[PDB]
Write a protein that binds this ligand. Structure first.
Ligand SMILES: Nc1ncnc2c1ncn2[C@@H]1O[C@H](CSCC[C@H](N)C(=O)O)[C@@H](O)[C@H]1O
Ligand SMILES: [Zn+2]
Ligand SMILES: [Zn+2]
Ligand SMILES: [Zn+2]
Ligand SMILES: [Zn+2]
Lengths: 8, 280
């Protein structure tokens, strides 16, 4: 993806 | 002032040898949580962070169309406290993972958590049943504080037993596409890791205390996907549970994951300090 994402 | 930067955040959303510890807010939540969340600074002259709007529950900007048809909710018909195998809601969860103290059972798989379905307002059971924990809100005594090396962080003021619900990751619910063009990406949380119609929580403009929880490679919190008032599987809510006893004073941390560090690691390294740090 283009942006950082926190995730489970 | 107390509101100047909050207002600015609201308007940007609309347009789109150390010091003695100082109390910089008695309560960042302004009375919206069951207990206050104070903010302190024992490091420098910075006031309590205020360039966001504190909200205790998720919000939307553009509409999300969450399925809230009450007749679509699965519910239970238990005549007890929902501690038995007869509880539909426990079955949807695989089992009810909560003990009588509201804590996750030792059997709970923290490396690969199941989806949790709590009881809801369609169930025949009572409001005090066993299968209701995250919906009871923040209970633990937490504090926002200035770290030495990592901006602001969150600590526990008391001992937190293993498997305790600590707080929810709250913010603005947005699409995957909207998330992909947000200028500030530091507060985004993906609700699901697959491709297709997936959603995010952006805590940048609207968020709660969880927006300040730093990353740790050996974390004392784990995020779990939970369903309460609705069961629209596109929109799980993110609940942090303790993975171990968290001692009074200890900073809270969770593993942000590879979809964070794949992007951010190119800019800066993890400074969690773990002997087993995976991102430095
Ligand atoms: N383990 C870690 N190592 C280095 N920086 C971290 C970190 N965990 C969190 N951060 C910093 O905090 C951001 C997430 S927001 C977390 C709260 C932040 N400390 C604040 O003051 O607002 C990250 O993008 C990074 O800038
Ligand atoms: Zn039940
Ligand atoms: Zn139920
Ligand atoms: Zn119940
Ligand atoms: Zn680390």
């Amino acid at each position: 993806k283009q942006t950082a994402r926190k995730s489970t | 002032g107390s509101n100047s930067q909050v207002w600015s955040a609201l308007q940007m959303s609309k347009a789109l040898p150390s010091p003695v510890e100082r109390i910089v807010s008695r309560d960042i939540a302004r009375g919206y949580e069951r207990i206050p969340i104070p903010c302190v600074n024992a490091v420098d002259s910075e006031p309590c962070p205020s360039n966001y709007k504190y909200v205790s529950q998720n919000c939307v900007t553009s509409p999300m169309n969450i399925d809230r048809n009450i007749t679509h909710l699965q519910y239970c018909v238990c005549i007890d406290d929902c501690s038995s195998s007869n509880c539909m809601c426990g079955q949807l969860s695989m089992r009810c993972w909560y003990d009588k103290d509201g804590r996750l059972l030792p059997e709970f798989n923290m490396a690969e958590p199941p989806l949790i379905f709590e009881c809801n307002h369609a169930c025949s059971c009572w409001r005090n049943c066993r299968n209701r924990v995250v919906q009871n809100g923040l209970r633990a005594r937490l504090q926002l504080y200035r770290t030495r090396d990592m901006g602001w962080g969150v600590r526990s003021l008391q001992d937190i037993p293993p498997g305790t619900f600590v707080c929810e990751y709250v913010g603005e619910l947005i699409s995957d596409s909207e998330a992909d063009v947000r200028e500030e990406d530091s507060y985004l949380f993906d609700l699901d890791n697959k491709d297709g119609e997936v959603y995010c929580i952006d805590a940048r403009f609207y968020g709660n205390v969880s927006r300040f929880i730093n990353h740790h490679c050996e974390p004392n919190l784990v995020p779990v996907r939970v369903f309460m008032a609705h069961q629209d599987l596109r929109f799980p809510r993110i609940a942090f549970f303790s993975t171990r006893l968290i001692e009074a004073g200890e900073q809270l941390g969770f593993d942000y994951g590879e979809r964070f560090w794949d992007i951010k690691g190119k800019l800066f390294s993890c400074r969690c300090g773990s002997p087993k740090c995976r991102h430095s």
